[PDB]
Structure 1
Amino acid sequence: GVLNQVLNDNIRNGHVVNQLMEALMQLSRQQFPTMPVDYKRSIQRGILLL
């Protein structure tokens, strides 16, 4: 008798974060062609944090 706002069931378990980290690992492994170098490596490692 109560309305309820539920989630997608890949969030109630932490399983979607695996796909997130696959994307994030890929982004770390990728260059940033136009971008500078000091600002780039810092970002790559900041992604590798998560």
Structure 2
Amino acid sequence: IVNTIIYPAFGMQRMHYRNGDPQTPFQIAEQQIQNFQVANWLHFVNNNQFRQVVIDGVLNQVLNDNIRDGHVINQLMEALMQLSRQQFPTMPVDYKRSIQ
């Protein structure tokens, strides 16, 4: 995603991305992205750690999940809004056209 997407079509790191083995390549992308919409996706995605903490109806540790996700959904709405402003330059035409 990172490479064949975002970064270049978004014009940012035209240095495509060089990863050896840090701690979460998908993430780090955050610290250096100038477009909030894009930027929230990142922290939320690199988190949403499957909030592994529950003890219901009497002893049922069933690693739960965000109300957010649940049906607050917005995540989606935001996942979209961020997408809604990824439409720009760098390489051949048949590219952006097709992608966007």
TM tier, shorter chain? 0.3 to 0.5
d(CA) in 1 for partners of 2:91, 2:71: 32
Indicate yes or no: 2:85 matched with 1:29.
yes
d(CA) in 1 for partners of 2:65, 2:98: 34
Bigger relative contact order, structure 1 or 2, given CA contacts below 8 A and separation 6+? 1
- Structure 1 segments, 4+ long, off by >3 Å, are 1-8, 11-18
Q: Deviations over 1:18-49 (max 9, x none)?
A: 324423443243223213322112211xxxxx
Structure 2: any 5+ residue segments left out of the alignment?
1-56
Change (3 A) 1:24 1:12: closer
Structure 1: any 5+ residue segments left out of the alignment?
45-50
Q: TM-score, normalised by structure 2?
A: 0.25
Cα RMSD for the two superposed structures:
3.9
More helix per residue: 1
d(CA) in 1 for partners of 2:62, 2:70: 15
Change (3 A) 1:34 1:12: closer
Change (3 A) 1:10 1:41: farther
Alignment-derived partner of residue 69 in structure 2: 13
